[PDB]
Amino acid sequence: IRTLLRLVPAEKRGAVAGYAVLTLLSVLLRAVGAVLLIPLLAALFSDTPSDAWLWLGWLTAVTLAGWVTDTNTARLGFDLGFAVLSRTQHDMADRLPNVAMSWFTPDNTATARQAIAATGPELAGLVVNLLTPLIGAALLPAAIGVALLFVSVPLGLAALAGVAVLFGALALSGRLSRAADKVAGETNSAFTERIIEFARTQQALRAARRVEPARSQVGSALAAQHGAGLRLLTMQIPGQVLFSLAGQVALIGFAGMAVWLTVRGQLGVPEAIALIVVLVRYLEPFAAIADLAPALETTRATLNRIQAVLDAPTLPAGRRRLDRTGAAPSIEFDDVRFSYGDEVVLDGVSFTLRPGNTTAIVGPSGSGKTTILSLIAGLQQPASGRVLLDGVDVTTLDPEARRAAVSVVFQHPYLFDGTLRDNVLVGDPEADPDDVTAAMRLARVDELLDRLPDGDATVVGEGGTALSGGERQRVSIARALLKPAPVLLVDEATSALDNANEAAVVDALTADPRPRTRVIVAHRLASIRHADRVLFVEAGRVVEDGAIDELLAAGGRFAQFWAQQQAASEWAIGST
Amino acid sequence: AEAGSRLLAPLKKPLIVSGVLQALITLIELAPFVLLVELARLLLGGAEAERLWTLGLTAVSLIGLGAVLAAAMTLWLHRVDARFAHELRGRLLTKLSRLPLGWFTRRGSASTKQLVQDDTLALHYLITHAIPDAVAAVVAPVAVLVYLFVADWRVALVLFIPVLVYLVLMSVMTIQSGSKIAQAPRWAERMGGEAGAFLEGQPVIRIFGGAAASRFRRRLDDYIDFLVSWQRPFVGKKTLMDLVTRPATFLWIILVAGVPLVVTGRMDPVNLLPFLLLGTTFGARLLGIGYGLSGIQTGMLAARRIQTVLDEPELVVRDPGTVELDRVSFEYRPGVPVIRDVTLTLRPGTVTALVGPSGSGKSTLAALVARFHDVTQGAIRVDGRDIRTLTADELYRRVGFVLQDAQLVHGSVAENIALAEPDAGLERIRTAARDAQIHDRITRMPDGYDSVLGAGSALSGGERQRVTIARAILADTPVLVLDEATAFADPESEYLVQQAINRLTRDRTVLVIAHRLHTITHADQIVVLDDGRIVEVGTHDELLAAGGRYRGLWDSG
Ligand SMILES: [Zn+2]
């Protein structure tokens, strides 16, 4: 709840102290203004109203000091709101790149996007729209209770002790309201969950001629659930109604107590009237706090999202670095284990890749093939075991050395709004034009530039020319080739309709002059025909390991996979 | 615009009664302040204790009456809403059972969930919480104003001085930032899109780095600087605007306006008491009107969406597997054709293939053959009968289809395979499954064919695709509308799906949505759609000999 203290930067900490002191002063001035209605209204309703001038002067002196203090607190509130907005947004932006890729669940990604986007204008005026009214309304009843001690000790003690009862009633009302809203949402979701299934699977039901029995079943289920839900409705006071009832009861009860003291002769009639007015002033802030229920709930949700983003599991760091020679590193796996959850993706996979020798990772286990590349690249650490690069563990590797160690061709191109040369240059902006041209040639991007009107300067991606899959994959391959990483990782998820993209991948694998070890996750014959060795990953473990010809001669699972893929390449509908 | 009000047409009288009851309840909640004023009136008059006791009894009775009225109104209103929402959900269930299948694909799953589960809850909140709260927020300040004017008009006028100052300051603020108010939603949407892009490009930032982080950071800094420049100069106006409507300011104004009047004898001292009781928090009540009416708009948006979906056009039933597309044309929206006067004759036992570049509308025509949408012009006939005249139960035993994103009904695997014919014996289910190259994996499951499938299951995409192909094989439709994207949707298991499709396509009028040319060369009839219309028709060799549009696609591959 109180996550806000860590959000404000250390620069504004003195301003936070000033804001807190001035908020306390504002509450005290408001309480003195409320309590000053005792002598003021006592004299006003007496036989000499002219005596009310002195207490009116004191009230209007407490006011204008209230205005000065509230102006200062509001100014500090706007200042702190802007500072918190800037600081939290920048800290959240800095945190995310260092977050492990395992944390980026679709729900986690949704919450992060909401935190970055929806929290723009809220935090600007959070402290001025929520914290100041909430603190003032929370401390004013207790401030009036304390200030009433000077008027009279037992009255002040009773007023201060009654604040706990009213806050308990307010908390109970909020609890009941939240429970009722949650139950209403859950019941509605339960009622409609049948229809969501009926709409999701509508093609299957319609094509199978089952739409009418399925609709009848869903309708009967809805009717039964509606009958059961309507039977259980019974008399219940809502939370808000209960709190309003509590406030009215407290007001009338304490007014009746004042009347009882008046008729018994302990208080004068003007004193009783003034006490009733101060009673209304004392019960007013609770209505203000109840009014801030939805805004407070929204701000609590936003702060929870920001805390969840900031509390993401950061990856570790290390001091050691790879050799600057840039030669091909030899990659080793030993007792490596990894799992997305209940299912195991890797179960003690262990292998060693010779330096500069291509390695092909194939098999039905789609997750495991990409997981091996992710572990090599360091995006996801292994649950058990070690990942090595020339006697250097990736977990202990320098983040800069890790960034400069591995180049990746992701399944998606991962482009952005900008020129094609800008997209390709991001792999290594410091490269000279000749190296960029060589990367474009090896990635077969020159053909795309011939196709495109304005050449490499053409705007691609989110604007300009909307490149297809076979073109954006070539752009990504150009990105990977341009970067002079000692290690290249290739993950083929290309649309099967492309023609020159396979040639580009083959050129990147074979025609690259850079002597770098290459690991490729491929499904197509041409890419893995050039691989020096192949790893057959199935059921989260390596089943076969060897050269192409050796595996084919052995006739193991890889031979069957080769036959299946070769047959799949020559597929034609309406023929053997 | 009228759709939202038209959905809530049957609830006009219950909602009016709810508004009246809420007005009465709100006026009852303000009763104890009037009773306290009268208590002061008869205390200063030296009334006997019996009269004060009777007044206290009246106040307690009114408190109890208000509580009981509120509880009864909430119970009755929740009951009425429960009946109406049940009727609405029945109507939605019936509607989704008759909208065209292509309506769902355009919207997607998220839009359907938003329609059925979120908007139907916003409608519940509209009926049972938003309208009564808005009625209370409109009745309370009006009743307070009337009562304070009745008490005294001289002190009631000065209450409008802070209100007039608030309105003047708000008006000055709003005109001074006319363009920025319109720009702010646009900039918020831009920053949301950029945040999504920054989150999506995380692997490139991690491996390559560079401008991928700076592109987001610079624009985030620009957005924050825009907000600061927008709202910083209004600190001077906004602090004063907040101070004006503060309760302490109202109390000071009321007392400085009343004490001179009371001292000079121009007003009875009791007549000031309503202003001290009710008048201080009047400004906060005025500001609460906007939040009260916000709920009505937020609910009316959901009502408008639900009615707009309920007003969607349905499928119209007017009046060996040969399909005759006769001058067929189709437009997604009025005035934007996608298919323009195409003619075809899918003869029996001929695997017709539909090929073209991206965005050529081949998928749209293939979908129209299965009646995912009704053809705007012309007619599609199966076995000489227009598809419009065929009911769904009779059409889909003539024109089966296996398109991308196959869907599994929740239940056992024997149910999913036997969805078209539940009465089929288990031997027939296994024969269909073995024909679809999915018998091995189904036997690999722990429970076998009794394993429960659904939204989430151990089967991958390429395996549930073969389960759906097994379902289509067991249905045994004469005509088939095949999509070739199912072949390479799962590259891991491409061969098995290709074998399943080969066994499915056996003596059936197939309409393949071609994506790879090399899988089409054996087809009986090729159809080249360049842009929403046929250009070349004939066998593969004939099109190669022609050397027209098809030759470029073949050379590209
Ligand atoms: Zn409700």
Q: A357 and A517 in contact (C-beta within 8 Å)? A: yes
- In chain A, which among 448-507 make CB contacts under 8 A with chain B? 468, 479, 483, 493, 495-497, 499
Phi-psi region of B138 (alpha: psi -120 to 50; beta: other; left: phi over 0): alpha
B283/A132 Cα distance (integer angstroms): 18
Is B461 annotated as contributing to ligand binding? no
Q: Give B74 Cα–ligand 1 centroid separation in angstroms.
A: 8
In one-letter notation, the amino acid at residue A562 is: W
Question: Token match 């072949």: residue?
Answer: B487
DSSP state of A47: S
Q: Dihedral of the CA atoms A563, A566, A569, A574 (nearest 10)?
A: -60
Q: Round to whole Å and give the CA distance between A519 and A389.
A: 13
Which of A209, A252, A288 minimises the CB distance to B393?
A209
In whole angstroms, how far apart are CA B222 and each of A189, A564, B211, B227?
A: 40, 55, 16, 9
- H/E run at residue B316: none
Q: Which two tokens stand for residue A375?
A: 């572990």
Q: CB distance B407–A204 less than 8 Å?
A: yes
For residue A251, count other CB atoms closer than 10 A to its CB: 21
Contact B82 A468 (CB under 8 A): no
Query: Boundaries of CATH 1.20.1560.10 in chain A?
Result: 12-308
Q: Distance between CA A75 and CA B240 in Å, rounded?
A: 11
**In the PDB record, what is the listed experimental method?**
cryo-EM
Q: What is the resolution of this structure in A?
A: 3.2
CA–CA distance, A381 with A383 (Å, rounded to integer): 7
A297: Cβ contacts below 8 Å, ≥ 6 apart: none
The size of chain A, in residues, is: 576
CB contact under 8 A, B492 and A523: yes
Closest chain A residue by Cα to residue B222: A86
Angle, CA A54 vertex, CA A51 and CA A58 arms, to 5°: 145
Q: Do A113 and B192 touch (CB under 8 A)?
A: yes
Residues in CB range of A571: below 8 A, 6 or more apart: B487, B498, B519
Residues in chain B: 557
- The token pair that represents A172 in the structure block: 């109970």
How many of the other CB atoms lie within 10 Å of CB of B536?
A: 17
Rounded Cα–Cα distance for residues B283 and A291 (Å): 14
What phi, psi does B379 have (nearest 5°)? -160, 145
CB B417 within 8 Å of CB B474: yes
Structure tokens at A475: 């752009």
Cα–Cα distance, A27 to A367 (Å, whole number): 60
Closest CA to A517 of A351, A301, A270: A351
Residue A456 phi, psi (nearest 5)? -65, -20
* Six token digits for residue A281: 């002033």
Say whether A195 and B93 touch across the interface (CB within 8 A). Answer: yes
| HSE-CB of B395 using CA atoms within 13 angstroms | 23
Which candidate, A457, A494, A496, places its Cα nearest to that of A472? A494
B211/A426 Cβ within 8 A: yes
CB pairs under 8 A between A and B: 374
Q: Of A123, A188, A232, A570, which to mutate for an interface test with B (greatest number of B Cβ within 10 Å)?
A: A188
Nearest to A166 by CA among A238, A253, A296, A262: A253
Spatial separation of the C-alpha atoms in residues B177 and A157, rounded to whole Å: 50
CA distance linking residue A46 with residue B271, whole number of Å? 15
Q: Name the residue among A124, A414, A493 with its Cβ closest to that of B203.
A: A414
In sequence order, which residues have a C-beta less than 8 Å from that of residue A373 and are 6 or more positions away? A361, A408, A489, A491, A519, A521
Cα–Cα dist A133/A75, whole Å: 14
B22 CB-near residues (< 8 Å, 6+ apart): B73, B132, B135, B136, B139
Question: Contact B26/B60 with Cβ under 8 angstroms?
Answer: no
Closest by Cα among A388, A417, A380, A421 to A405: A388
β-strands A406-409, A487-491 pairing: parallel
Q: What's B255-305 look like in SS3?
A: HHHHHHHHHHCCCCHHHHHHHHHHHCCHHHHHHHHHHHHHHHHHHHHHHHH
**Residue A85 and residue A127 in contact, taking contact as beta carbons nearer than 8 Å:** no
- Distance separating alpha carbons of residues B365 and B325, to the nearest angstrom: 10
Nearest-Cα distance to chain A for B177, in Å, is 16
Cβ neighbours, 10 Å, residue A445:
25
Distance CA B118, CA B298 (A): 12
Ligand 1 midpoint to CA A291 (Å):
18
The three-state (H, E, C) secondary structure of B109-120, written as one string: HHHHHHHHHHHH
Alpha carbon A43 to chain centroid, angstroms: 60
Q: Where are the beta strands (DSSP E) in B442-508?
A: 452-453, 479-482
CB A38 within 8 A of CB A271: yes
- Angle CA B55–B61–B62, to nearest 5: 90
Mark B230-252 as b/e (b = at least 16 C-beta within 10 Å): bbeebbeebbebbbbbbbbbbbb
- Using the beta-carbon criterion (under 8 Å), do A208 and B468 form an inter-chain contact? no
Tell me, rounded to whole angstroms, the distance of Cα B73 from its chain centroid: 30
For A224, A228, A254, A442, B82, the CA distances from B86, given in Å and listed in that order, are 11, 12, 46, 64, 6
What's at A199, amino acid-wise? Answer: A
Picking from A56, A208, A222, the nearest residue to B90 by CB comes out as A222
Half-sphere exposure of residue A95: CA atoms within 13 angstroms, side-chain side: 20
Decide: A317 and A504 in contact? Cβ < 8 Å.
Answer: no
Report the distance separating Cα B365 and Cα B354, nearest Å.
9
Half-sphere exposure of B63 (CA within 13 A, CB side): 21
For residues B121 and B85, give the distance between their C-alpha atoms in angstroms, rounded to a whole number.
9
Closest CA to B441 of B497, B505, B498: B497
Query: What six digits make up the tokens of B197?
Result: 């892009």
Q: Which of B54, B61, B259, B467 to mutate to test the interface with A (most CBs of A within 10 A)?
A: B259
Residue B80: C-alpha distances to residues A114, B24, B86 (Å): 36, 20, 10
DSSP result, B401-450: EE-SS----SEEHHHHHTSS-TTS-HHHHHHHHHHTT-HHHHHHSSSGGG
* Of A92, A131, A133, A134, residue with least CA distance to A113: A92
CATH 1.20.1560.10 is the classification of domain A12-308: yes
The secondary element (H helix, E strand) that includes residue A11 is none
Which residue in A has a C-alpha nearest to residue B355's C-alpha?
Answer: A497
Give the DSSP letter string of A69-88. HHHHHHHHHHHHHHHHHHHH
Local structure of residue B451 (DSSP, 8 states): P
Which A-chain residues 164-183 have CB contacts (< 8 A) with chain B? none
Show residues of chain B in contact with A113, CB under 8 Å: 192, 195-196, 199
Look at the block and give the residue holding tokens 């590797």: A397
Task: Report the distance separating Cα B383 and Cα B398, nearest Å.
Answer: 9
DSSP-assigned beta bridge partners for residue A490:
A409, A520
Distance CA A58, CA B405 (A): 77
Residues B78 and A235: their CA atoms lie apart, in Å, by 11
Determine the residue type at A164. Answer: A
A139: region left, alpha or beta (phi > 0 left; psi from -120 to 50 alpha)? alpha
List beta partners, residue B385. B382
CB contact at 8 A, A490 and A505: yes
Question: Per-domain residue ranges for chain B?
Answer: 1-151+303-314, 323-556
Q: How far is A45 from chain B (nearest CA, A)?
A: 6
Token pair recorded at residue A287: 């209505």
CATH of B323-556, one of 2.50.20.10, 3.30.70.120, 3.50.50.60, 3.40.50.300: 3.40.50.300
Cβ contacts (< 8 Å) between B498 and chain A: which residues? Answer: 568, 571
Give contacts of A189 with chain B, Cβ < 8 Å: 117, 121
Distance B27 CA to ligand 1 centre (A): 22
The closest alpha carbon to B6, from B312, B314, B304, B309, belongs to B304
Q: In whole angstroms, what is the distance from residue B400 CA to residue B476 CA? A: 8
Residue pair B463/B445 in contact (Cβ under 8 Å)? The answer is no
Those residues whose C-beta lies under 8 Å from the C-beta of residue A416, and which sit 6 or more positions away, are: A423, A461, A462, B197, B201, B212, B215
C-alpha atoms less than 13 angstroms from C-alpha of A413 in its C-beta half-sphere = 26
Q: What phi and psi, each to the nearest 5 degrees, are found at residue A565?
A: -70, -40
Residue with tokens 């691609």: A460
Q: Report yes or no: B156 and B40 within 8 Å, Cβ to Cβ.
A: no
Q: Is A190 in the B-facing interface, judged by CB distances under 8 Å? A: no
CA distances from B92 to A199, B234, B311 (A): 10, 48, 11
Mutation target among B73, B99, B205, B207 for the A interface, most CBs of A within 10 A = B207
Neighbours of B20 (CB within 10 A): 12
DSSP secondary-structure letter at A335? E
Neighbours of A12 (CB within 10 A): 18
**Residue that has been written with the tokens 């802030």 in this structure:** A285
Instruction: Report phi then psi at B514, rounded to 5.
Output: -65, 135
State phi, psi for B203 to the nearest 5 degrees.
-60, -40
Chain centre distance of CA B280 = 43
- Rounded alpha-carbon distances, angstroms, from residue A2 to A111, A304, A306, A313: 19, 10, 12, 21
What one-letter code names the amino acid at B210? G
B493 is known to lie in a ligand binding site: no
Cβ atoms within 10 Å, residue A154: 9
List the one residue out of A11, A13, A121, A29 whose CA is nearest residue A71: A29
Residue in A345, A315, A347 with CA at minimum distance from that of residue A333 = A347
> How far is A312 from A318, CA to CA, in rounded Å?
19
The minimal CB distance from B207 to the residues A366, A406, A495 is found for A406
CB neighbour class for B108 (10 Å; exposed up to 12, middle 13-18, buried from 19):
exposed
CA distance B264 to B51: 31
In this structure, are residues B249 and B125 in contact, taking their beta carbons and an 8 Å threshold? no
B263·A67 Cβ contact <8 A: no
Q: Which residues lie closer than 8 Å to B6 by C-beta, 6 or more apart?
A: B307
Structure tokens at B285: 């009540």
Question: For chain A, how big is the Rg over CA atoms in Å?
Answer: 36
Hunting for tokens 């199912």 — which residue is that? B486
A209 inside 8 A of chain B by CB: yes
Residue A90: what are its φ and ψ, rounded to 5°? Answer: -70, -40
A331-570: CATH architecture: 3-Layer(aba) Sandwich (3.40)
**Residues whose CB falls within 8 Å of the CB of residue B271, separated by 6 or more in sequence, listed in order:** B151, B152, B155
A210·B248 Cβ contact <8 A: no
Q: Find out whether B117 and B85 touch, Cβ atoms under 8 Å.
A: no
Q: Ligand 1 mean position to B128 CA, how many Å?
A: 5
Q: Which residues in chain B touch residue A341, judged by CB atoms under 8 angstroms apart?
A: none
- The string of DSSP letters for B334-391 reads TT-EEEEEEEEEE-TT--EEEE-STTSSHHHHHHHHTTSS--SEEEEEETTEEGGGS-
Distance B340 CA to ligand 1 centre (A): 51
Report d(CA B85, CA A27) in Å as an integer: 47
Instruction: Write b or e for each residue in B253-276: b if 16 or more Cβ atoms lie within 10 A of its Cβ, otherwise e.
Output: bbbebbbebbbeeebebbbbbbbb
